């Protein structure tokens, strides 16, 4: 069953993101020691995640990826109700309460164009503001609002080419790379 990607993610990631992870991707109908490649991406993707979440002020963001299905629908729902956003027909990850928006972050193995395009063709209701993150520095927001400060983000792209080090110090980037 086991495999090096699965070790070095377990390795790698917080224990509770890779709760998270492997809870998410269970109940999604994936196997996280078979599907290795999307067990790193999603560790990777809920990390991001995270430490967006934190870049803001206190109050700024209401975390919706990392719940489990019906909570996240309820908590979006509650958003829309209070405030007046349209229902995204997908779920997103973040809600900006200073920015009123819902937020969909994206990690990418490739350029940043396709990858953005691809999400802004799902997402119909233009409204949910989008955020891409490359594997090596590239970052590309919706009508150039990139939301949090300087640093968060510099934060952020450091640490994905860290994991992008680390993959390719144990041989196990060209796969990661070429899976996506
Ligand atoms: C709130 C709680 C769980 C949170 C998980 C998430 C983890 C966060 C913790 C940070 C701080 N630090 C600092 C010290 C080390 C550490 O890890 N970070 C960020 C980087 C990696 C990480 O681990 N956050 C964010 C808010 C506070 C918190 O803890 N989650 C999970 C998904 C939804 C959510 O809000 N909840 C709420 C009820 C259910 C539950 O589990
Ligand atoms: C969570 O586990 C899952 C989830 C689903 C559907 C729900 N998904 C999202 O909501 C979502 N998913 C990703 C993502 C997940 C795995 C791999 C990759 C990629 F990096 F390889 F592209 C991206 N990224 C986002 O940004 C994002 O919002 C289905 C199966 N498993
Ligand atoms: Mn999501
Ligand atoms: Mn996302």
Known sequence: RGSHMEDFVRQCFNPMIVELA???????????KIETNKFAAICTHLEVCFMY??????????????????????????????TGV???????????????????????????????????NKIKSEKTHIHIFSFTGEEMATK???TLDEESRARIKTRLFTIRQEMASRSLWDSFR???
Request: net charge negative; hydrophobic share 30%; charged share 35%.
């Open 178 to 180: 070429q899976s996506e």
């Open 144 to 146: 150039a609002d990139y």
């Open 22 to 32: 492997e809870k998410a991707m269970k109940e999604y109908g994936e196997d996280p």
């Open 86 to 120: 349209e229902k995204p027909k997908f779920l997103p990850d973040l809600y900006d309460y200073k920015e009123n928006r819902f937020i969909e972050i994206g990690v990418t193995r490739r350029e940043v164009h396709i990858y953005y395009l691809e999400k802004a």
């Open 53 to 82: 979440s934190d870049g803001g002020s206190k109050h700024r963001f209401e975390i919706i990826e990392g719940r489990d299905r019906i909570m996240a629908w309820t908590v979006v729902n509650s958003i829309c109700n209070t």
